[PDB]
Nucleic acid binder design. Sequence first.
DNA 1: GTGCCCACAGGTCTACCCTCCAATCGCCACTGAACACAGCTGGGAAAATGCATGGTTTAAATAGCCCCAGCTGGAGA
Length: 75
Amino acid sequence: IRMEDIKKAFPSHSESSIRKRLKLCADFKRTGMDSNWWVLKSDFRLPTEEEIRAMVSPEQCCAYYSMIAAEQRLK
DNA sequence: GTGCCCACAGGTCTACCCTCCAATCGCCACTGAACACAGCTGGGAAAATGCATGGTTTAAATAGCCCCAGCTGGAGA
């Protein structure tokens, strides 16, 4: 993957925060091939679709959106 | 060898838990009040005792009256 795809999706995320999830599972290849890409580690098993669905629920996303909208209105 | 990133450590702030203090309620102990029972006093009722005007016998000074009772004369056998 590329880092600025994630920086386009989450632009409020700073340094450490946005790349602490790239710290694990990914490694910054910059030499020869795959240069300036974050390749997936060969020992890392990418989680299946049901595990990724079990990570975050849509209702948690709605609760987070309610929190940040109320944060804006109060601010 | 200078900008810039990630990781680890430290500090601060928030949350939860435990401890202490205060307040309230309940129970027990003591005090006060009320009710009930007993005793003493006072009043009323009943019973018992102390009554009073009649009588009484003792004459006698009288006198009318009245039953009876002798009793003696008269009559009959």
